[PDB]
């Protein structure tokens, strides 16, 4: 069992730089997986980013290069660092883990740990 | 140990030819060495030739061909050309390395006799 | 880091590797180029055999003494057997002897090392006729010494040839020690190919595997430029010369104010090698000898093996720049051993302590191919399906040599236990406890990771492979299809007997 907190998130404009951190606490979380979601006010939430124990970054769609993500194992964090980010984006952003799964992990129901969430607004 | 059993013989012109062939029951362990032997009528034991197991030869002269099979522990003696004092009493003699390596021609050596063949 | 670091110790183990092969094809057919103008039935030279032995099993003993009455060499002065008895126990040698040789037995009352007059005319007076020394207990150093006293009793003999009381020589095993003699006349020394006969257990099936290639890889390697370090305890061959140059170094060695009683064959070799004179390995010549089949006993001989070459080494570097352009390719591959040995053990505590599955499975499946490509090389120069059994050779090496060299090291500088298997003993519980973190760190499945699921695969694979070969060895064990012919024959006059 590990608990997921999240920092940080605040009012920027169109074009700027903007980071996100999750921390989670446990026995050990190096053998975690960490994945992160944002869900829209209406629609259904969707996978953004995610990283391996082993650091293999996973990058969803129209994501590719704007996103990047990272983790450091000294302070046991989870950071995900968003570029040339555009107004549709966004949301609120919710960061899980995982230790055992399938080969499906873009489903809400392969992450079992969830956290709390920040709402990140951007305006034009 | 062994015994050599050794068979031929009959009465043969002076133009003519006869074989040999001697036999021996047991191990001649690569390095032992056999000699024939005959005797005259009236006289001693003389050196004939000798070959060893593994290889080479010794006569006395060309006259007589030494020739071993290495397979069925047996070995022949052809003479050709032969000759009214040629004619005599053959033995067929083993020799053993144990005591020493050296060869001789000496029949107090040899221990392993055989017997006539005339 | 680690990528490169496995990449690098791969690369170069695989041309060192080249290398060596290439060196012993070209000496093989070096070799074959000289036998070719060698005459039939050729005895210029005279040779002497040297037989030495301690608490022999009759059987072998009497196998070996067949084995030399059954040399096909037309020119042996006389044969030497010199045993360190003295003793109502040792009796049995004696009478052995008599049953396959002559009854001349003599038992002296003093060592010749020992003695003030070192010249064997007080012990023997006959040089035709063969004899048998018995003499108190000393050890091999002192055994080989009387062969030679004994053996420079006539100018006659130019050359001699050791054979341990567990070797069983061929037919031509004499003549092919002896013809590179007078082939040049720098060579002094002539190396004979050893092989097991008994492989009816899982550490002998490797040791006679591990022996094979060492034999005709590295001797291989050595001979082509003429810098053998080790003649071959079983089989080996000598000038006469030399000989009574060398024999007191050889018998007054001082390392550290003690007498040495190990390495008496490597110590023979570097005192060759000291002179400037040349070595040549011949693999034409067989010789068949049997292999410890307990762990814990190959375990102390090689710890003794590694104390003698570890010594020695020292030797070896000082006396290979007396060989000019020559020594160059000994140094080198002195220090190949001592960065491999290091290396190895850095790579080891490496894994240990970072335990990533990743560097674990890449560093297996490297070791994998490595060792495969030697077994197959290996088939392919033996013509035998039976050297693809070299996969198993690294867990052996892994949990046998290590400790034995770690205590090598160890000693240069209930307690006799301590001091032999004690070391061992703490190896393992350090790799057992490497392996249990390595998997507790690890403990987790993700089957939507590329490197994971790479990983996993590849240690599978590992496993399976394992397994099948096991599982080959344990039916061919039943089948005894492994067994070499020699000793099948051996198995069935023992029967008979
Ligand atoms: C179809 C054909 C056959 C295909 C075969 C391959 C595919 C197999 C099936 C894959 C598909 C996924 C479905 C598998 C279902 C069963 C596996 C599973 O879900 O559990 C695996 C196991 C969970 O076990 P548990 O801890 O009890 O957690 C249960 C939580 N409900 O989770 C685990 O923790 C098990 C993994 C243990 C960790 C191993 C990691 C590697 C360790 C390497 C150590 C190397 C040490 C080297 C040391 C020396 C180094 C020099
Ligand atoms: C839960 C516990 C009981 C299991 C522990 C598993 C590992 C700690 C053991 C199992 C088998 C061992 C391996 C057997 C063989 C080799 C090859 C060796 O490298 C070579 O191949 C050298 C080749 C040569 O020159 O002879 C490196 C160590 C290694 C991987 C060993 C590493 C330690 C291993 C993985
Ligand atoms: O005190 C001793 C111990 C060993 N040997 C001889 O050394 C040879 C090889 O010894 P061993 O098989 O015990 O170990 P190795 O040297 O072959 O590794 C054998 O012929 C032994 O008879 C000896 O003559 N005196
Ligand atoms: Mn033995
Ligand atoms: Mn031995």
Not at chain 2, 113 to 118: K, L, R
Not at chain 3, 281 to 304: H, K
């Amino acid at each position: 069992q590990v608990q997921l907190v999240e920092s940080g998130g605040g009012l920027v404009q169109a074009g700027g730089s903007l980071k996100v951190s999750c921390a989670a606490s446990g026995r050990a979380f190096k053998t975690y997986r960490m994945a992160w979601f944002r869900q829209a006010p209406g629609k259904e939430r969707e996978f953004v980013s995610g990283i391996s124990a082993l650091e293999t970054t996973y990058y969803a769609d129209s994501v590719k290069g704007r996103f990047t993500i990272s983790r450091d194992n000294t302070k046991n964090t989870v950071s995900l660092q968003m570029d040339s980010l555009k107004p549709e984006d966004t949301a609120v952003y919710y960061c899980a883990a995982r230790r055992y799964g399938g080969t499906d992990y873009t489903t809400t129901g392969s992450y079992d740990y969830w956290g709390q969430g920040t709402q990140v607004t951007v305006s034009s | 140990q062994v015994q050599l059993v050794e068979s031929g013989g009959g009465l043969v012109q002076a133009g003519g030819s006869l074989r040999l062939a001697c036999a021996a029951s047991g191990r001649i362990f690569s390095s032992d060495t056999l000699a024939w032997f005959r005797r005259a009528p009236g006289k001693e034991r003389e050196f004939v030739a000798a070959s060893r197991w593994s290889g080479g030869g010794t006569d006395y002269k060309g006259r007589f061909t030494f020739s071993r099979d290495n397979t069925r522990n047996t070995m022949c003696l052809e003479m050709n050309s032969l000759k009214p004092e040629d004619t005599a009493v053959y033995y067929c003699a083993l020799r053993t390395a144990r005591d020493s390596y050296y060869y001789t021609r000496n029949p107090t050596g040899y221990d392993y006799w055989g017997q006539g063949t005339q | 880091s680690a990528v490169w670091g496995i990449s690098v110790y791969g690369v170069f183990v695989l041309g060192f590797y080249i290398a060596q092969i290439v060196f012993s094809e070209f000496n093989r057919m070096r070799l074959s180029d000289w036998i070719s103008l060698r005459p039939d039935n050729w005895n210029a030279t005279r040779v002497a055999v040297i037989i030495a032995g301690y608490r022999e099993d009759p059987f072998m003993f009497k196998k070996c003494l067949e084995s030399v009455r059954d040399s096909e060499y037309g020119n042996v002065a006389r044969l030497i057997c010199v045993i360190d008895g003295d003793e109502e126990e040792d009796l049995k040698m004696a009478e052995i002897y008599k049953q396959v040789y002559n009854d001349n037995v003599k038992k002296p009352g003093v060592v010749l090392c020992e003695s003030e007059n070192k010249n064997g005319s007080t012990i023997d007076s006959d040089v035709s006729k063969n004899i048998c020394i018995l003499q108190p207990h000393r050890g091999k150093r002192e055994s080989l010494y009387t062969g030679f006293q004994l053996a420079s009793m006539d100018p006659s003999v130019h050359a001699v040839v050791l054979i341990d009381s567990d070797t069983v020589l061929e037919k031509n095993a004499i003549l092919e020690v002896v013809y590179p003699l007078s082939c040049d006349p720098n060579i002094k020394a002539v190396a004979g190919e050893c092989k097991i006969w008994n492989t009816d257990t899982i550490l002998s099936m490797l040791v006679s595997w591990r022996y094979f290639s060492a034999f005709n890889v590295e001797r291989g390697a050595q001979s082509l430029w003429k810098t053998v370090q080790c003649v071959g305890g079983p089989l080996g061959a000598y000038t006469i010369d030399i000989i009574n140059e060398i024999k007191d170094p050889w018998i007054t060695q001082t390392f550290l104010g003690n007498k040495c009683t190990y390495g008496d064959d490597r110590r023979l070799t570097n005192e060759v090698l000291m002179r400037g004179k040349k070595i040549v390995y011949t693999p034409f010549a067989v010789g068949w000898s049997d292999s410890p089949t307990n762990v814990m006993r190959y375990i102390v001989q090689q710890t003794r093996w590694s104390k003698s070459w570890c010594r020695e080494i020292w030797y070896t570097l000082g006396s290979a720049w007396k060989h000019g352009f020559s020594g160059i390719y000994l140094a080198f591959e002195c220090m190949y051993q001592i960065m491999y040995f290091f290396l190895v053990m850095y790579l080891f505590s490496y894994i240990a302590i970072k335990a990533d599955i990743r560097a674990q499975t890449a560093t297996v499946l490297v070791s994998t191919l490595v060792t495969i490509i030697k077994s197959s090389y290996l088939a392919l120069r033996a013509k035998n399906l039976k050297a693809f059994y070299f996969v198993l050779y690294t867990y052996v090496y892994f949990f046998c040599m290590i400790p034995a060299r770690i205590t090598a090291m160890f000693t240069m500088f209930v307690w006799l236990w301590a001091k032999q298997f004690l070391i061992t003993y703490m190896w393992w519980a350090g790799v057992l406890a490497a392996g249990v973190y390595s998997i507790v760190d690890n403990w987790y499945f993700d089957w939507a990771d590329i490197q994971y699921r790479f990983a996993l695969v590849g240690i599978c694979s590992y496993l399976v492979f394992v397994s099948i070969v096991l599982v080959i060895y344990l039916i061919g064990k039943i089948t005894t299809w492994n067994y070499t012919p020699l000793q099948k024959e051996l198995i069935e006059e023992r029967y008979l007997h």
